[PDB]
Amino acid sequence: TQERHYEHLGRCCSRCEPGKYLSSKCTPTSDSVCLPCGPDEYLDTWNEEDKCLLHKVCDAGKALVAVDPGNHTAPRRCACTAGYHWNSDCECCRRNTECAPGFGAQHPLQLNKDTVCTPCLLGFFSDVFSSTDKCKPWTNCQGTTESDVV
Amino acid sequence: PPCTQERHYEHLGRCCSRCEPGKYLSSKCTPTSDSVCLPCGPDEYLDTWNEEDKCLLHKVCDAGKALVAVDPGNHTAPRRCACTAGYHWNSDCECCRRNTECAPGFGAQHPLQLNKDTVCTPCLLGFFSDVFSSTDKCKPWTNCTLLGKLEAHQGTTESDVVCSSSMTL
Ligand SMILES: [Cl-]
Ligand SMILES: [Cl-]
Ligand SMILES: [Cl-]
Ligand code: NA
Ligand code: NA
């Protein structure tokens, strides 16, 4: 089987499980020697690789941070920091749209996506530009969509 | 005043400091003591400099929609969700959709972005992809020159170079 095995010395020797690299090919005495990937390294396949793949750095200069895989078996994702979203056209993190007064941010907020803004409905207001703040209820004592009752 | 509304509250003729995001007002200030501000409990949050006697409860990210919480333990901000690995939030359906798979000869642009669809790009000469995958980038060809071997099979953007096992003089 090509999936679990490679051929060497006229026999089918076993490939390395995801998370492990092929340190030594099989011998006339031994099957393959497979060792765990080091820090920030991975292999997500049954393989014959002589080294693990290194996770791409998430560039802090682009406002990116790492999303932890909690394993050595998955490729690692990055994401824009809270309040920012990845734009594939600029290939850059943009500030999330601030919903103007009279509008509120829709929840739940989606990581790495821009804010959806919706108008405050009767009985609710928003007095700030914010990419996170929902519309707030009027305090019970005239209010508008942009201002609380006085 | 100079008791700044942004960071303070008035109580019994005194200027007292509001609690930081992530903490709630356990007890108001006294003549010889500050505000007692204590952390919000598990699953709870407050996202403003506040004078709240209790914190708000986080809603779970909807697993039925294939969403997962990011930094679920954050007490200082409203919760953010993201589609599970291999899926992206689609704004048209407001839902998680399976990531685009890059065909053989194409690779995923790295680093992969959480909650975003895979962007697929052609493998350059010297690199290949033999599978449909929303994660795999193009892999460099095996280097037979490095080993001083001849090639048994020419590489393509869809298949790896294969080195000969034969020796030459
Ligand atoms: Cl990676
Ligand atoms: Cl707006
Ligand atoms: Cl929340
Ligand atoms: Na607003
Ligand atoms: Na591919």
Curated annotation (Swiss-Prot), chain A:
| Record's function text | Receptor for TNFSF11/RANKL/TRANCE/OPGL; essential for RANKL-mediated osteoclastogenesis. Its interaction with EEIG1 promotes osteoclastogenesis via facilitating the transcription of NFATC1 and activation of PLCG2. Involved in the regulation of interactions between T-cells and dendritic cells.
Under what name is this protein listed? Answer: Tumor necrosis factor receptor superfamily member 11A
Q: Where in the cell is it found?
A: Cell membrane; Membrane raft
What assembly does the database describe for this protein?
Binds to the clefts between the subunits of the TNFSF11 ligand trimer to form a heterohexamer. Part of a complex composed of EEIG1, TNFRSF11A/RANK, PLCG2, GAB2, TEC and BTK; complex formation increases in the presence of TNFSF11/RANKL. Interacts with TRAF1, TRAF2, TRAF3, TRAF5 and TRAF6. Interacts (via cytoplasmic domain) with GAB2. Interacts (via cytoplasmic domain); with EEIG1 (via N-terminus); when in the presence of TNFSF11/RANKL.
Tell me the ranges holding the TNFR-Cys repeats. 1-34, 37-78, 80-117, 120-150
Q: Which residues lie on this side of the membrane: Extracellular?
A: 1-150
Name the species this protein comes from: Mus musculus
Q: Which residues are glycosylated?
A: 71, 140
- Annotated residues that bind Na(+) are located at 99-100, 103, 126, 128
Gene symbol? Answer: Tnfrsf11a
Q: List the disulfide bonds.
A: 13-26, 16-34, 37-52, 58-78, 80-93, 90-92, 99-117, 120-135
Expressed in which tissues: Ubiquitous expression with high levels in trabecular bone, thymus, small intestine, lung, brain and kidney. Weakly expressed in spleen and bone marrow.
From Swiss-Prot, chain B:
What is the annotated tissue distribution of the protein whose record heads this document?
A: Ubiquitous expression with high levels in trabecular bone, thymus, small intestine, lung, brain and kidney. Weakly expressed in spleen and bone marrow.
Q: Spell out the subcellular localization from the entry.
A: Cell membrane; Membrane raft
What residue ranges lie in the Extracellular compartment?
Answer: 1-169
Disulphide connectivity of cysteines: 3-15, 16-29, 19-37, 40-55, 61-81, 83-96, 93-95, 102-120, 123-138, 144-163
**Glycosylation: residue positions:** 74, 143
- Chain positions of TNFR-Cys repeats: 3-37, 40-81, 83-120, 123-163
Organism domain of life: Eukaryota
Q: Specify which residues bind Na(+) according to the UniProt entry for this protein.
A: 102-103, 106, 129, 131
**Oligomer status and interactors:** Binds to the clefts between the subunits of the TNFSF11 ligand trimer to form a heterohexamer. Part of a complex composed of EEIG1, TNFRSF11A/RANK, PLCG2, GAB2, TEC and BTK; complex formation increases in the presence of TNFSF11/RANKL. Interacts with TRAF1, TRAF2, TRAF3, TRAF5 and TRAF6. Interacts (via cytoplasmic domain) with GAB2. Interacts (via cytoplasmic domain); with EEIG1 (via N-terminus); when in the presence of TNFSF11/RANKL.
| Purpose | Receptor for TNFSF11/RANKL/TRANCE/OPGL; essential for RANKL-mediated osteoclastogenesis. Its interaction with EEIG1 promotes osteoclastogenesis via facilitating the transcription of NFATC1 and activation of PLCG2. Involved in the regulation of interactions between T-cells and dendritic cells.
Q: What is this protein called?
A: Tumor necrosis factor receptor superfamily member 11A
> Which organism was this protein described from?
Mus musculus (Mouse)
